[PDB]
Amino acid sequence: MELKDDDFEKISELGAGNGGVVFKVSHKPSGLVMARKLIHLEIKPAIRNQIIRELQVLHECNSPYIVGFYGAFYSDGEISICMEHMDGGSLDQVLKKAGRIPEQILGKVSIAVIKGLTYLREKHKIMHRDVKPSNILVNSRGEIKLCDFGVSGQLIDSMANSFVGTRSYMSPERLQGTHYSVQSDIWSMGLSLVEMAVGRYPIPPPPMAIFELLDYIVNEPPPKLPSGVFSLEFQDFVNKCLIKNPAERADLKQLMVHAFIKRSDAEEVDFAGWLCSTIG
Ligand SMILES: O=C(NOCCO)c1cc(CN2OCCCC2=O)c(F)c(F)c1Nc1ccc(I)cc1F
Ligand SMILES: Nc1ncnc2c1ncn2[C@@H]1O[C@H](COP(=O)(O)OP(=O)(O)NP(=O)(O)O)[C@@H](O)[C@H]1O
Ligand SMILES: [Mg+2]
Numbered sequence: 009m010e011l012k013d014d015d016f017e018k019i020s021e022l023g024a025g026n027g028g029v030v031f032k033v034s035h036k037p038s039g040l041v042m043a044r045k046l047i048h049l050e051i052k053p054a055i056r057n058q059i060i061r062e063l064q065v066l067h068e069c070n071s072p073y074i075v076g077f078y079g080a081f082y083s084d085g086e087i088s089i090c091m092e093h094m095d096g097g098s099l100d101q102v103l104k105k106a107g108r109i110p111e112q113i114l115g116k117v118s119i120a121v122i123k124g125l126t127y128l129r130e131k132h133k134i135m136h137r138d139v140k141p142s143n144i145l146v147n148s149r150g151e152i153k154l155c156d157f158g159v160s161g162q163l164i165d166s167m168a169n170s171f172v173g174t175r176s177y178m179s180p181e182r183l184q185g186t187h188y189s190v191q192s193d194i195w196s197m198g199l200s201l202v203e204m205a206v207g208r209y210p211i212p213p214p215p216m217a218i219f220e221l222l223d224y225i226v227n228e229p230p231p232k233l234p235s236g237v238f239s240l241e242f243q244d245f246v247n248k249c250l251i252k253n254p255a256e257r258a259d260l261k262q263l264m265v266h267a268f269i270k271r272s273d274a275e276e277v278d279f280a281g282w283l284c285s286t287i288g
Contacts, residue, residue: 011035011079011090016044022093023101025142026172032093035078042078043094047087049166056082062160063089069132073124075145075155091155096283099204100142105287108207111242115272116279117144117204118245120152121197122269126260129190134159137188138169139196140177141204150280175209176221181254183226191254194263198249202231205238205246241268 015037022030028047035042049056063080066089076092096102099117103109109117121144128134136143137158145153158164170178179195182188202210210231212224230250233243245268251257263269 009038009079009090011081011088013081013083013088022097027167027169035090040078041093043091045089045091047089047163047167048085049087051166055162055166056087058162059087059160059166062162063087065132065159069128069159071124071127071131072151073120073127073153075153092153094145094147094151094153096146096148096287098142099144099146100140102146102283102287103141103204103207109204110282111205111238112272112275112277113279113282114201114205114242115268115275116277117152118197118201118263119269119273120144121154121200122260122263124154125190125193125197128154128157129260132159135188135190136193136196137164138177139193139200140175141200144200146279146283148280148284150278150283152279171218174218174221175211176218176225178222178225179254180226180252183222186254189254190260191257194249194257194259195254198246199231201246201249202233205233205242239268241266241271244268 015035017034017036019032019034022032022043024030028045031044031046033042033044060080060082066077066080069077075094078090080087080089082088099109121139125136128136135158136154138156139154143154143156145155177196177199179192182192199210211221212228213231216224230252233246245263245266248258248266258266
């Protein structure tokens, strides 16, 4: 869209994670209100421009289930990724205001997440590589969209994601040296669903620093939903997502026809209204 740091004006901070900070900004010359993610990396100009070059592909993403992209550029040691502003935030934020999320809302989220993944896989042959509650954004129109996926191979390598932060959604196969695949996103999604359903990160079942957590994941059995509160469909769905053997774990075709999804797809759920009310 042709953006440059002076076009912008800061409205407020939407939040920060381990690797960056996101601002709600005004893009003055167009009038657009967007979210601006700033990423700071101590890398040589060569690979940096390679990142901005690779990030340019986000322009060709165009799906109801994928967050909107406006442009990526570099300035002042910061890489800027400029997005559709999502007025409802991430599901990780909603989760703090709501404590936990209803399995009917979660069925809608799953249908969104599944469709978004398939879109990225069918249309761009990229895997998401970071499906978690904080990377699922919602807005007051009741839309549910994925962001922060691995569009840039250079950017992935530079961020050394795997050891940072306190929670991990990495799958067993990956932490045992397997090549990355869509199955690994299924595991992430199920672990996400469990976390959003019960209201806390499932591993371990009710201090653990990253490496122990990672060891715990490849060794202990997978997390499961509690015993009385959720339908037996929702927990078979989540169970089929968290099968430790990627061979057995369900795939997107299978999940899309699972009992839980068929029902959720039919249930008349007012997500926007549930949202503006849970957080207003
Ligand atoms: O922003 C990111 N992650 O957030 C961390 C920094 O706050 C981000 C990270 C990576 C690299 N990566 O790929 C996933 C596996 C782990 C990993 O390290 C990447 F390739 C990206 F393109 C990113 N941004 C991004 C993508 C789509 C939209 I629409 C908007 C965006 F901002
Ligand atoms: N397009 C957007 N619209 C509104 N809020 C956003 C948008 N993108 C990101 N955010 C918020 O900005 C904050 C940080 O996002 P982010 O930088 O990716 O850290 P994170 O994904 O939460 N954890 P991590 O990826 O490990 O650093 C979160 O609270 C998001 O909900
Ligand atoms: Mg994120």
